[PDB]
Design a protein around this nucleic acid. Structure first.
Lengths: 199, 63, 117, 144
RNA sequence: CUUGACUGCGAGACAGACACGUCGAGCAGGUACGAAAGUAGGUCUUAGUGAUCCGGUGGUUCUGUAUGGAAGGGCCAUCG
RNA sequence: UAGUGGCGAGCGAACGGGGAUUAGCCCUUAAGCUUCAUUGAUUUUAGCGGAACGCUCUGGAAAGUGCGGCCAUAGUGGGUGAUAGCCCCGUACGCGAAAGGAUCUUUGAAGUGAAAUCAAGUAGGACGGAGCACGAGAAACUUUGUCUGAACAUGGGGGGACCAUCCUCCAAGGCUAAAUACUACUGACUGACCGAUAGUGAACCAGUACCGUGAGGGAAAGGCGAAAAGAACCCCGGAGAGGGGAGUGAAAUAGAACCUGAAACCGUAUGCGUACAAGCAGUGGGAGCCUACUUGUUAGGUGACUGCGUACCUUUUGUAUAAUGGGUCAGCGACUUAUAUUCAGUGGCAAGCUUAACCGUAUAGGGUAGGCGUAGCGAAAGCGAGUCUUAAUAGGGCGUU
């Protein structure tokens, strides 16, 4: 089914790879991922929380002045924000079947647009960025996602300075970061692990 | 649970799959005055009228 | 995400206050009087697109009337020929011929003294 | 697929019209609330059940019934889902291993609402009359 | 005569915002009567009335906080 | 939800499950904990080293352009005359402590735990209260202000009035870590937070100035430039203030009240109109005049004369209304958020669907306790594709492929 660099096929499932693309589903999984990485850490003060303004600024009548009840009204420039923020969460619920079906719809389009490149194995020996630039250049390859079955330590130490690549495992791959990089490298061990999860 | 039903409405309206069933009024404490035909036709458990369903299942917290 | 609205409010005041250009006093220079004055000038501009079609229709008729009585015929006797004859010529160019081409307007009022109805 | 090229189907997301932003938005000046009276005030809510002051239905009709505390631990299974157990024995515990029956349930009566399929043995579990027949049709048996 | 001022109901309507309200057979429990066809689910008709919640009373097959009971509750009837 | 409640408004369990944490020791004397004394160990209080770029173009200035390299366990850091992985300070990554602090750990020591010896003015009760979700209610159980008052393992308490029978426990002596709550104060990282009317009241000598007898209330005020190179000298003036030059700089209409420099408001110049004409001040028509241009049947300005014309908001049956509000400008200023729920649209799965805490090398995956669905009817026991009722399977309501 899928073809590799090292002269073989893999015969992957029609389930995990090569299904039909649902952009309504992948949009929901991308908006869900991009919101669960938001930290809702902000707050503004309400009219109760701004310092001061206990008493009325003047009497209710006789003064020819509009009705006030505190120096810290939201109309006044000292006052509180009217619907002042508190730290809230922007986490939202994907179904577990719905994350998996959206990944299974992305992998199908990475195959269909030639953005997925399968290699037999991908390992560097030295913890060195120059050694991994020189091996991605044998594949004609920049702005890559490298998806292995388990991220090894030298492959993580290389390419974590390198400007346009990431090294993920299969569990740690996510809808945004394999729709963002212009190529995805999966090993043959990765498409096995993608079919344990999705097929 | 962050929405409280009226406890006083759940005593009155039991919910079935045919609707919200209730008992009848006028069946207390003055019963020799009315006929037996009017004590017979109020003895059951009626159903709740269509104009009444929206007000009751806002009280019984279901809207 | 706070947004300050000083750039959009000044370009929106400057559109309404460019449409107020040429107005007396505070109608052309402060916004609360110029907003009302540009609204009113576009209510009048709507209304008077209808009256322009009426004010010229009266002016044509008044000159056709004045140029017909030169030839011994009123307005309403001149127009009356043409449910019986048929020139199918309108008030706009008969007023232009009553002023300018006065001999070709005399030729039309004799075709209407030939109708007699 | 690009992050620059994703959108959902038409009708999946809506604009969330905001009330009170000018008189061309359609919800100008009042925001769907109309004019005076409480429903346009803030906190302008009518309590549930309130009918302007007459006796409402939840105080005018009589209370009736008691709730049985005997039926809190009672539950019903049906013959459609008796084959979902394992090991050809339908017990009280085996109905809890498959998620057919909650915990704190200790009285199960099985009705007829489908087909049994497998030959199962129902121990310590009441069955109806039409359900006992459809189990013993499919090789079942009963004891306690 | 001495009870149909019946018991269970009730097709279908009328009124009707809702709660209410009004009109109405056949089988039985069973009936007075008529010797019988049959009439009778009160009065020539329309006023003579009062929700719920609390109590009171008589039933009940229902519930009955370990179990057997009771207490309390529910249902049905009726009173304040 | 059960209960509870002028059975109103409301208040609200437990059983049973899923987890976080994990220890029980003693009153014939103990774990544990404090204080020292030591045994190793780990941190903290400062630091040290820390890779790799040149030419060219525009420019006041290069990090930007153009070309070619390099480094990378260091590439979206800070700022350097405009935007720097290779200029600088850092960063990744290694190292480092005379002397203290703190945590952990050895193994002694003095203590403490500790009240004495398995619990008597105690349990129980009567009055009056309070609590238990429980408004004393059939009111259990717990606490007690007043008054009383036991049994002793062939005892005693509970199991929601109460009594029997079972079951399970030993009150009236104690001590116990972790999981849990909070952050005035430190430090590091972070932000679909704010950017001087915002964000702390407070970016600036702010809880200041000021107001109060006092408690207390409580402001306004940031920006020259890359560098002060902050204007030597000359001229008018009062050895002024403030200017005109000259210098400085890329720029001084960046000259210190200093980036940008808007609007109201106030001016000077120019063109046109305006001193016999009545009113929401415009609009339709429209002459003349004046500027640019090119041809004229244009473009800009002014608008004599004339037709029609009683602002705006709000509130109302209705307002030019002599009804409300607005002196004007510029900023600011009002449908939000959380948690439950219903309906619609749009999706995933589908007779099933979905997890909550929590676990997690952590938006994955696990975790299906639970919630809803597949069956209803009845107040309920219950019966179930069926009850109720009545002595009546006889007659209707609800449900049902």
């Amino acid at each position: 089914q899928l073809n590799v660099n090292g002269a073989q096929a893999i015969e992957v499932s029609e389930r995990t790879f090569g299904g039909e693309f649902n952009e309504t589903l992948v949009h929901q999984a991308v908006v869900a991922y991009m919101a669960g990485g938001r930290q809702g850490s902000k707050a503004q003060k309400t009219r109760s929380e701004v310092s001061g303004g206990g008493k009325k600024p003047w009497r209710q009548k006789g003064t020819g002045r509009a009705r006030a009840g505190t120096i810290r009204s939201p109309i006044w420039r000292g006052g509180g924000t009217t619907f002042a923020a508190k730290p809230r969460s922007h986490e939202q619920k994907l179904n577990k079947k719905m994350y998996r079906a959206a990944l299974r719809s992305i992998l199908a389009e990475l195959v269909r647009l030639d953005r997925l490149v399968v290699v037999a194995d991908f390992a560097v020996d030295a913890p060195k960025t120059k050694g991994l630039v020189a091996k991605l250049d044998t594949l004609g390859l920049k702005d890559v996602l490298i998806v292995t079955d388990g991220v090894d330590e030298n492959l993580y130490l290389a390419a974590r300075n390198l400007a346009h690549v990431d090294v993920r495992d299969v569990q740690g791959s996510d809808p945004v970061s394999l729709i963002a990089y212009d190529k995805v490298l999966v090993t043959v061990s990765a498409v096995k692990k993608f079919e344990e999860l999705l097929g | 649970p962050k929405m409280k039903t009226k406890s006083g409405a759940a005593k009155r309206f039991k919910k079935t799959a045919g609707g919200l069933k209730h008992k009848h009024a006028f069946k207390s404490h003055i019963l020799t005055k009315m006929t037996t035909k009017r004590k017979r036709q109020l003895r059951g458990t009626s159903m709740l009228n269509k104009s009444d369903v929206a007000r009751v299942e806002r009280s019984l917290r279901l809207r | 995400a706070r947004v300050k609205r000083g750039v959009i409010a000044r370009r929106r005041h400057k559109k309404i206050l460019k449409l107020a250009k040429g107005y007396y006093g505070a109608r052309s220079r402060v916004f609360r009087v110029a907003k009302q004055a540009v609204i009113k000038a576009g209510q009048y501009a709507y209304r008077d697109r209808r009256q322009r079609k009426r004010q010229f229709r009266a002016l044509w008729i008044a000159r056709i009337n004045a140029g017909a009585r030169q030839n011994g015929l009123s307005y309403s006797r001149l127009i009356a020929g043409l449910k019986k004859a048929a020139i199918e010529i309108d008030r706009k160019v008969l007023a232009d011929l009553a002023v300018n081409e006065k001999a070709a307007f005399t030729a039309i009022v004799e075709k209407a003294k030939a109708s007699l109805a | 697929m690009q992050l620059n090229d994703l959108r959902s189907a038409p009708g999946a997301r809506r604009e969330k019209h905001r009330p009170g932003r000018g008189i061309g938005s359609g919800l100008g000046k009042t925001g769907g609330r109309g004019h005076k009276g409480l429903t346009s005030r803030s906190g302008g809510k009518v309590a549930p059940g309130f009918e302007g002051g007459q006796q409402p239905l939840h105080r005018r009709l009589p209370k009736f019934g008691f709730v049985s505390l005997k039926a809190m631990d009672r539950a019903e299974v049906r013959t459609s889902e008796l084959a979902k157990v394992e090991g050809d024995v339908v017990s009280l515990q085996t109905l809890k291993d498959a998620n057919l029956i909650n915990q704190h349930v200790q009285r199960v009566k099985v009705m007829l609402s489908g087909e049994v399929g497998r030959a199962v043995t129902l121990k310590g579990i009441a069955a109806t009359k039409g359900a006992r027949a459809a189990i013993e049709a499919a090789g079942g048996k009963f004891e306690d």
